[PDB]
Design a protein around this ligand. Structure first.
Ligand code: CL
Lengths: 111, 250, 240, 195, 241, 244, 231, 235, 243
């Protein structure tokens, strides 16, 4: 039977300071016991000073990042170029994820 | 695109007339005469075969049509409208009756279904009424022989005998003088041929006249043997030769 | 599906189909609502060109929407049944989800919304009906009387009338109804309602219907004799 | 849910329904009323799947109340029971059926007679002198077969009912936290507070 | 008078849109003719190519509906091709559904029923065409069946259609009065084609070159159209007698 | 587009009337008269057939009086074809109720639903209304014997005695004159026939131009019987009252 | 006359009056100008107010980082069409990782407008658009008409008195086409162009609207004090 | 007849232009924007003295930071308000923030042209949408059935609009206080109204950043009416 | 009367006036032609230069369908684009199911049936274009012209637009003078001449020439635009003939 999920490995890490924040992630991408790439980035600048990583199943991860990046673009179009605050981004991402509640994005997301 | 005509094309005028139904009846008046006579042991329905050209083969155009083995139909008015009504009538006898009860519908109920179809063309969106009046003759076990007229409005009436179309006024008067409640089927056929000659102008023979009966069961026309309860169709179309035989002793 | 825009604007900015629906209301039998200090009374005209009627079974002019709210109307009788049915369904639906019966304002707002929807939907004509909706909110003793009309607008009234010759009875109510002192009792409220109809009706026989609504689902319809006593009493005081 | 009982006597129908609502290893409530008044002289008790029970009961209640307002008239117990049966008979072939069993106790004012109907989630209806749903019936039916008489009073019916609850409290595995008892007669529906 | 714009009845019980669709039939100014032999059915039609820039091979009003059925149209080419595509689709579906080739008369009835619907339903106009279907049916033999915008249809011993149809019709009538039979008593289709052209020449009073005509022939198990040289071969045979 | 040919069947006149409903009522006023009279022990339905021909089959015929269920019947005035559409709907509705509640449908409930269908055709859909007026005669255990009428508008009312179709104005005046509340069925039968005989557009009222029916409790004990009169029975009742 | 009831009807001379009436709504609209060089493309728009208490109706809309337009006529119709362009640009990016060619953008608008001119019930769009963009084949300027006709130009103008600017640009063609690598000068030429369409009114700070896109410049709009430089 | 979405020869939509005539028949509504807040005032215009005027609801809350006044066929506004409220609350659910006043107005205006042969006709009501957000501060918008919306410093709509607008042209300046705006709405309403202005036939409201959208009591407005009459007599 | 107010209505003649009114819109358009040659077809069109501001070579009017068919039209340009969009859908579904690229006669009927369908109902408008199109398939070269009614035929040469009569006369001379056939490269030159000669009927505004061609030998059976040296050579040939 076809299994629509896979595991691409890797790990990510976010820490917040007083006037800064970091989002780190390794660049290794794997399936089973094989290395697919030694340098495949999964931490992205999404605009409006928001960085994002969706780690787990890379296909779902890329799809989510792609949809959120697009959500930022349309937020500008619809609300007079207003900056998307980190709290508003967070709430928006919840709805992106929960929209597929019964066929989930197989990722841990950090912004 | 798509049928944007979702509104009625037949509507009430200030005087209360339904214009399109009246005009449909006018088309029936222009149509060639057809008639029906009910005897004690059968029914006869007849009409003239108005040929469009002498090069046309009028045998290929059937004005009298079998609906069920015991029910037949003839009309006056627009031929194409009649043809599609016969198709629908044959189908509805199966879908709304035979496929449910395992037997053919009684005459009155098949007539009722055809009447419904014609009524809907009077009220539904984007259609004109049918431009025909039907005469439906038939037999069933519990009602015996019957004869019905169906008009463009969807109204139907049972008749002892009647005529519709071109010379219906004169033909009805002729039938009133001749009809009694003791007529045998052969007497009714004789009167049918007499009545029709008045309205026919040109040739009057078995090739220009179409005539069918609802009478006794015809085991020879069944196509098989072995089932006692199945005894054959009561509907039979008289042949060109069979008509000419009766035109000599006229 | 039939799509035609039947209710549309004209050059002068009127929606004629909505305005012609008001004419149907003007043709309908007169209906009046008067609210007292502790009650609301709904009075209705019944035309007397119809003798040989069976009043047991003939649809009553005042309808219960719930045990605590009533609806009367003026205009097309057939149209009103559709509004009443929808209102009754919404009443039960409200009890089901909110666990509390409708307020009179809410029920009115719903009925008015339905009427409005039929003024800018394709393939439909507006309702030829104006309604008077009266009752008491759950656990409340303040009387409520509302009016709706084909356009969809609604409002609250101390007293109001609709239907044929309603302008005459509105005139009467405008000088005979004191805002500072509404009819203090049931008797006073019924009398003022009967008086107002007697300006327009004809005979006070089987031409007037009266329904009294009191707090906590206390609704009762008066009989002929009970109403006739008000008619008899009013005429004797008039000869003065 | 779990225990719902019904007894029809000379002049009334008596319904007894357990008060416990249990989920997992916790009794969440011990005062739950597993019943809805459909009309002034008609009462319905219910048991079955969590959520389904109340949702179905209130849906039926809304429909009967709607009917009452429309016609200014009370449906007979027989008419209400047939409406309820049909809804369950529809439900059993739906994508997700209502898993609810009901008893309908009513007093027919036109006949001046009490009536008790037992309907399961499949839409299986029967009129009975006494009824039960679930495992309760395995004790109460035989008990009532012995002690029930058709001409009993409401008081005799309540004593007969006490005998059923006592037997269930002795032999049933679960603590159902007693019952709420309600009487349906010519004067409508009332609750017995001390049982 | 909107009763003349859509297919509803006029006060005198007429359908003017159907009547005006009949007048569109002659818009091409072309006459067609169909006759039956013993073994075959021949249909001929005039071929007028006025523009010198036209590719004459693409100018045709005869269509091969199925292997066995042919159809000639009298009316504008857009409506003609509309009818042809539907007839082809209907004949193909019939074979798939019922396991045998659609008879000429059954296809005629079906196309006539479709035409009837346009006379009753308002949103669809009638097609301004008359369709003449020909074949050698495996049960009925040589067959000619003709459809019009009214939804009328009937079988023919022979037939003609077009502006000068009446002249051709009477010419054929007078021949069958003389011969006393329902068909052309001839063995080969070649001579039945010759008969068809001969009697069209007499009725219309015009001579034809190889490019003035169009010929379709139906035999058992196939219907085919003739090339210019096949017709020329046929014209030579008539001239040498 | 198709807007050009739309009659707009569901609109108001400037006066606030529905054109198509008014014109449908005008149509119905030319249909054969039908009368309903409610007595204390039953109901009478009487209707005049539209100008009959001598070759019409009279016994196997139904034009005016139809059975909805065992307890309810209707008299028709208007287009028969339109009426049969509505009659079949009403018949199905009665069976739906019986299936749902295991009780025969109360008369008013059936009348309201049929009247609601008519109403719909006047408010939405762009279709012509049904050109039919009904007289409903029926019994139930709530109100006993009941007469109702409905018309193309979808408005219905209850009556002690009523007429529909042709000459209702004259017919109603005659009914209003001779009707009283303590009346019996056999008296109502006579009143119905006497009224038709005076309001008819024909030369003389005969058995072949009439349909007749009664709904009595004249069965055996506490149950209702529908009697659709046969031709010979109408001939006898016409002689018994001395009209022929 | 008798042939202007809807878009589905041709006149006896083969005209579509509803489309022509839609074209008329553009003529009543406030003037807007478009022009380009080989490196940049510039939109200039005169904004219109209801009165002195109101704001000035915004004429320019961004479609992508590399594309945008200006409007003249029914503003809600411009919002619908610009939204469609935003989606089409976006589809090209998400699916093909490809910036939508300004030419395809024109073809897509043509076909969307056309469908509204051949069917019953609908109406033509009542707005004209000037689309500018920078793609893989350099700078572009398009003129959209709601008839469906889209035209690529070096420069143009639409709206009331647009003929003045259109004549000016026709004279200035050889000059402004070679303003390469100089944004402020290309704008100056566009501001001088729109000045040929002014009557009794002059360009103020809350009246003028300018947009620019080019080789190393995303589509950006200038309003308020940011256009004071050019008056 | 003719199509609902038909253009006139002058390039305007017949139905939209006709709905604008309906709005001219409506009761007057005035809005004034200041740096201390936005004031919204309306003429109630009771058709009869028996009608309880406090049930006339022509000023309406959309959210805590956005209010709305109406003029014309006021029954048409109900679904517009319902959409506005849902749009406002939905945006808060999706983005954990207040929605911009302009974005709200644009959302309401998207409904406007969704008519044809969607609803059967345009709305017969104009809206004054007033609110505050962090980006653009206090704002007033005029939303028309054409789908067009203009931002205004001050705006009047309804029967007395052209006279009231000319008055607002003279009176408005960029330093008006909230109290000054309140009195100015009352003054201009009293001028254009038929019946004499009092607390029962006119209603005031405002939106401030601090307290949000508030409809004033009849007692509060009555004192502002008394304060206004005294100030006009004082010179 | 009023028979001309609604599409699909027959007049008492048996005519559809709305289609005839669409033909008037075609006659108003610019000139376009088609020339059939030895092993292919050549298409050319007149592009009126309304203003100096039009970018030369950048408002392309000839359109390709699939990889082997060319289409050009006169009249309402948007209507023509709608027809080509449909043509591309028709050609794609043919190739999807049957593998082989759509034959030209097959493609011609697909457009024909679609255009004819827009004369059947009053809820649609007829097409305001006559379309000249064709290409090379397994049976060689084919040229077609399709009109608003849905009527189409095969052509040796075709012309439509404001200068159709001038172009037709010039086309007839080529057919008479070359019975054996015209070569592809010759047909390109002749196409230029005919557009220049047909421009006399539209001579207020000067114009821009656009040519395309399909040839079994010259373009390998694929549709290509004529550009650069071959275009200028064809323009010069045309310029020499008018003087
Ligand atoms: Cl068929």
């Amino acid at each position: 039977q076809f299994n629509p999920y896979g595991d691409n490995g890797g790990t990510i890490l976010g820490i917040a300071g007083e006037d800064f924040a970091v989002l780190a992630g390794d660049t290794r991408n794997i399936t089973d016991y094989s290395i697919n790439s030694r340098y495949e980035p999964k931490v992205f600048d999404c605009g409006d000073n928001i960085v994002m990583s969706a780690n787990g199943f890379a296909a779902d991860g890329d799809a989510l990042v792609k949809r959120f990046k697009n959500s930022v673009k349309w937020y500008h179009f619809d609300h007079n170029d207003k900056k998307l605050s980190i709290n508003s981004a967070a709430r928006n991402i919840q709805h992106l994820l929960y929209g597929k509640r019964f066929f989930p994005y197989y990722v841990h997301t950090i912004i | 695109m798509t049928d944007r005509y979702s509104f009625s094309l037949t509507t009430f005028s200030p005087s209360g007339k339904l214009g399109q139904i009246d005009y449909a009846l006018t088309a029936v008046k222009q149509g060639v005469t057809s008639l029906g006579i009910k005897a004690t042991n059968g029914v006869v329905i007849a009409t003239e075969k108005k040929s469009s050209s002498p090069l046309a083969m009028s045998e290929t155009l059937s004005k009298v049509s079998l609906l069920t083995p015991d029910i037949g139909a003839v009309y006056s008015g627009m031929g194409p409208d009649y043809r599609v009504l016969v198709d629908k009538s044959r189908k509805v006898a199966h879908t709304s009756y035979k496929r449910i009860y395992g037997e053919y519908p009684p005459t009155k109920l098949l007539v009722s279904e055809v009447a419904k179809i014609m009524q809907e063309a009077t009220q539904s969106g984007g259609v004109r009424p049918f431009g025909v009046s039907l005469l439906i003759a038939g037999h069933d076990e519990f009602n015996g022989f019957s004869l019905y007229q169906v008009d463009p409005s969807g109204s139907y009436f049972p008749w002892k005998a009647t005529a519709i179309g071109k010379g219906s006024v004169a033909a009805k008067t002729f039938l009133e003088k001749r009809w009694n409640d003791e007529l045998e089927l052969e007497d009714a056929i004789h009167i049918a041929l007499l009545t029709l000659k008045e309205s026919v102008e040109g040739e009057f023979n078995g090739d220009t006249i179409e005539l069918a009966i609802i009478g006794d069961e015809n085991p020879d026309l069944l196509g098989y043997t072995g089932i006692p309860t199945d005894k054959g169709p009561r509907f039979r179309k008289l042949t060109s030769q069979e008509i000419n035989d009766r035109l000599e002793a006229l | 599906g039939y799509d035609r825009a039947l209710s549309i604007f004209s050059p002068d900015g009127h929606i004629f189909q909505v305005e012609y629906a008001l004419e149907a209301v003007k043709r309908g039998t007169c209906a009046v609502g008067v609210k007292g200090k502790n009650c609301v009374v709904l009075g209705c005209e019944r035309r007397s060109t119809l003798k040989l009627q069976d009043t047991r079974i003939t649809p009553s002019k005042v309808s219960k929407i719930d045990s605590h709210v009533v609806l009367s109307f003026s205009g097309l009788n057939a149209d009103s049944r559709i509004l009443i049915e929808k209102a009754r369904v919404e009443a039960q639906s409200h009890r089901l989800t909110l666990e509390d019966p409708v307020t009179v304002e809410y029920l009115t707002r719903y009925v008015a919304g339905v009427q409005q929807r039929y003024t800018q939907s394709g393939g439909v004509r507006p309702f030829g009906v104006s309604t008077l909706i009266a009752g008491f909110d759950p656990r409340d003793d303040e009387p409520k009387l509302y009016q709706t009309e084909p356009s969809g607008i609604y409002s609250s009234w101390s007293a109001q009338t609709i239907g044929r010759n309603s302008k005459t009875v509105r005139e009467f109510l405008e000088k005979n109804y004191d805002r500072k002192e509404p009819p203090a009792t049931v008797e006073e409220c019924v009398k003022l309602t009967v008086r107002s109809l007697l300006e327009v009706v004809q005979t006070g026989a089987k031409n007037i219907e009266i329904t009294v609504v009191k707090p906590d689902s206390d609704i009762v319809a008066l009989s002929s004799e009970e109403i006739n006593q008000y008619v008899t009493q009013i005429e004797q005081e008039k000869q003065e | 849910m779990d225990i719902i009982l019904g007894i029809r006597v000379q002049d009334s129908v008596i319904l007894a329904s357990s008060k416990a609502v249990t989920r997992g290893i916790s009794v969440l409530k011990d005062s739950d009323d597993k019943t809805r008044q459909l009309s002034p002289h008609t009462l319905m008790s219910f048991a079955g799947e969590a959520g389904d029970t109340v949702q179905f009961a209130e849906y039926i209640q809304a429909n009967i109340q709607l009917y009452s307002i429309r016609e200014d008239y009370e449906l007979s117990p027989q008419a209400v029971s047939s409406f309820v049966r049909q809804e369950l008979a529809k439900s059993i072939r739906s994508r997700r059926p209502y898993q609810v069993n009901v008893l309908i106790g009513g007093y027919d004012k036109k006949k001046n007679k009490p009536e008790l109907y037992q309907i399961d989630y499949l839409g299986t209806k029967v009129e009975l002198p006494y009824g039960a749903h679930g495992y309760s019936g395995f004790y109460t039916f035989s008990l009532l077969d012995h002690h029930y008489r058709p001409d009993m009073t409401t008081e005799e019916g309540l004593d007969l009912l006490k005998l059923c609850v006592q037997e269930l409290e002795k032999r049933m595995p679960m603590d159902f936290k007693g019952v709420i008892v309600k009487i349906v007669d010519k004067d409508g529906i009332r609750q017995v507070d001390d049982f | 008078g909107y009763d003349r714009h859509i297919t509803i009845f006029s006060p005198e019980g007429r359908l003017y849109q159907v009547e005006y669709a009949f007048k569109a039939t002659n818009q091409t100014n072309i006459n067609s003719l169909a006759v039956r032999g013993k073994d075959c059915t021949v249909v001929i039609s005039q071929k007028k190519v006025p523009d010198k820039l036209l590719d004459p091979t693409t100018v045709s009003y005869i269509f091969c509906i199925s292997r066995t059925i042919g159809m000639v149209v009298n009316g504008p080419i857009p409506d003609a091709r509309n009818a042809a595509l539907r007839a082809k689709a209907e004949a193909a579906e019939f074979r798939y559904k019922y396991g045998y080739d659609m008879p000429c008369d059954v296809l005629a009835k079906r196309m006539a029923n479709l035409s009837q619907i346009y006379t009753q339903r308002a949103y669809m106009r009638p097609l301004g065409v008359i369709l003449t279907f020909v074949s050698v049916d495996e049960e009925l033999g040589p067959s000619i069946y003709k459809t019009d915008p009214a939804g009328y249809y009937v079988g023919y011993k022979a037939t003609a259609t077009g502006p000068k149809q009446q002249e051709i019709t009477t010419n054929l009538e007078n021949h069958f009065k003389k011969s006393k039979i329902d068909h052309i008593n001839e063995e080969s289709w070649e001579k039945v084609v010759e008969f068809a052209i001969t009697h069209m020449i007499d009725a219309l009073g015009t001579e034809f070159s190889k490019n003035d005509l169009e010929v379709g022939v139906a035999t058992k198990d196939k219907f085919f159209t003739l090339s210019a040289e096949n017709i020329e071969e046929r014209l030579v045979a008539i001239a040498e007698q | 587009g198709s807007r050009r040919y739309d009659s707009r069947t569901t609109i108001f006149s400037p006066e606030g009337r529905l054109y198509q409903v008014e014109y449908a009522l005008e149509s119905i006023s030319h249909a054969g008269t039908a009368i309903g009279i409610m007595a204390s022990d039953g109901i009478v339905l009487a209707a005049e057939r539209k100008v009959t021909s001598t070759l019409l089959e009279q016994d196997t015929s139904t034009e005016k009086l139809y059975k909805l269920n065992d307890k309810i019947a209707v008299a028709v005035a208007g287009l028969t074809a339109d009426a049969e559409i509505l009659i079949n709907t009403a018949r199905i509705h009665a069976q739906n109720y019986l299936k749902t509640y295991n009780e025969d449908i109360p008369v008013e409930i059936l009348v309201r639903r049929l009247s609601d269908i008519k109403q719909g055709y006047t408010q939405h859909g762009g279709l012509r209304p049904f050109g039919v007026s009904f007289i409903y005669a029926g019994y139930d255990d709530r109100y006993g014997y009941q007469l109702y009428t409905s018309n193309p508008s979808g408005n219905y009312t209850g009556w002690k005695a009523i007429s529909v179709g042709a000459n209702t104005s004259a017919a109603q005046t005659l009914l209003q004159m001779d009707y009283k509340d303590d009346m019996k069925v056999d008296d109502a039968i006579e009143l119905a026939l006497k009224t038709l005989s005076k309001t008819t557009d024909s030369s003389a009222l005969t058995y072949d131009r009439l349909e007749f029916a009664t709904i009595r409790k004249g069965a055996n004990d506490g149950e209702v019987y529908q009697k659709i009169f046969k031709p010979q029975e109408i001939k006898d009742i016409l002689v018994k009252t001395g009209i022929t | 006359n008798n042939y202007d009831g809807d878009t589905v009807t041709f006149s006896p001379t083969g005209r579509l009056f509803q489309v022509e009436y839609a074209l008329e709504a553009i003529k009543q609209g406030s003037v807007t100008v478009g022009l380009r060089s080989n490196t940049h493309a510039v939109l200039v728009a005169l904004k219109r107010n209801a009165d002195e208490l109101s704001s000035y109706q915004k004429k320019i809309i961004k479609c992508d980082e590399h594309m945008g337009l200006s409007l003249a006529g029914l503003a809600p119709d411009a919002r619908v069409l610009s939204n469609y362009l935003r989606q089409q640009c976006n589809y090209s990016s998400l699916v093909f990782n490809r910036k939508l060619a300004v030419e395809r953008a024109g073809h897509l608008l043509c076909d969307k407008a056309q469908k509204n001119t051949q069917s019953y019930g609908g109406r033509p769009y009542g707005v004209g658009l000037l689309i500018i963009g920078y793609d893989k084949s350099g700078a572009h300027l398009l003129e959209f008409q709601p008839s469906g006709n889209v035209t690529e130009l070096y420069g143009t103008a639409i709206g009331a008195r647009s003929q003045g600017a259109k004549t000016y640009l026709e004279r200035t063609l050889d000059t402004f086409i070679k303003i390469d690598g100089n944004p402020d000068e290309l704008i100056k030429a566009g501001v001088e162009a729109i000045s040929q369409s002014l009557r009794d009114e002059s360009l103020t700070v809350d009246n003028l609207s300018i947009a620019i896109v080019g080789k190393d410049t995303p589509f950006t709009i200038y309003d308020g004090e940011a256009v004071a430089k050019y008056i | 007849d003719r199509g609902v979405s038909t253009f006139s020869p002058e390039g305007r939509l017949f139905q939209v232009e006709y709905s604008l005539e309906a709005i001219k028949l409506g009761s007057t509504a005035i809005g004034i924007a200041t740096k201390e807040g936005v004031v919204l005032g309306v003429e109630k215009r009771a058709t009869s003295p028996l009608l309880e005027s406090d049930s006339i609801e022509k000023i309406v809350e959309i959210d805590r930071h956005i209010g709305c006044a109406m003029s014309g066929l006021t029954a048409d506004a109900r679904s517009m308000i319902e959409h506005a409220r849902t749009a406002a609350v939905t945006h808060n659910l999706y983005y954990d923030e207040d929605i911009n006043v302009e974005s709200l107005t644009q959302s309401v205006c998207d409904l406007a042209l969704r008519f044809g042969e969607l609803m059967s006709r345009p709305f017969g009501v104009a809206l004054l949408i007033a609110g505050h957000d962090a980006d653009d501060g206090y704002q007033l918008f005029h939303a028309e059935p054409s789908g067009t919306f203009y931002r205004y410093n001050a705006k009047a709509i309804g029967s007395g609009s052209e006279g009231a607008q000319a008055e607002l042209l003279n009176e408005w300046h960029s330093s008006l206080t909230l109290k000054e705006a309140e009195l100015l709405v009352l003054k201009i309403l009293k001028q254009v109204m038929e019946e004499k202005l009092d607390e029962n036939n006119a209603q005031l409201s405002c939106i401030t950043k601090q307290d949000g959208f508030k409809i004033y009591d009849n007692e509060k407005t009555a004192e502002l009416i008394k304060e206004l009459k005294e100030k006009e007599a004082a010179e | 009367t009023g028979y001309d107010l609604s599409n699909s209505v027959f007049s008492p003649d048996g005519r559809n006036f709305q289609v005839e009114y669409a033909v008037k819109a075609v006659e108003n358009g610019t000139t376009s032609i088609g020339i059939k040659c030895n092993d292919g077809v050549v298409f050319a069109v007149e592009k009126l230069i309304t203003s100096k501001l039009l970018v030369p070579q950048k408002n392309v009017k000839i359109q390709v369908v699939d990889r082997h068919i060319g289409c050009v039209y006169s009249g309402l340009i948007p209507d023509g684009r709608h027809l080509v969009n449909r043509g591309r859908e028709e050609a794609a579904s043919f190739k999807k199911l049957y593998k082989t690229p759509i034959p030209i006669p097959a493609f011609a009927d697909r457009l024909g049936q679609y255009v004819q369908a827009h004369t059947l109902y009053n809820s649609v408008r007829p097409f305001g274009v006559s379309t000249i199109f064709g290409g090379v398939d397994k049976n060689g070269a084919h040229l077609y012209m399709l009109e608003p009614s849905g009527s189409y035929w095969g052509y040796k040469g075709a012309a439509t637009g404001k200068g159709r009569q001038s172009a037709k006369a010039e086309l007839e001379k080529l057919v008479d003078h070359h019975p054996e056939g015209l070569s592809a490269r010759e047909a390109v030159k002749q196409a230029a001449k005919i557009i220049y000669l047909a421009h006399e009927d539209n001579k207020e505004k000067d114009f821009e020439l656009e040519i395309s061609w399909c040839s079994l030998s010259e373009t390998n059976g694929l549709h290509k635009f004529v550009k650069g040296d071959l275009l200028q050579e064809a323009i010069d040939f045309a310029q020499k003939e008018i003087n």
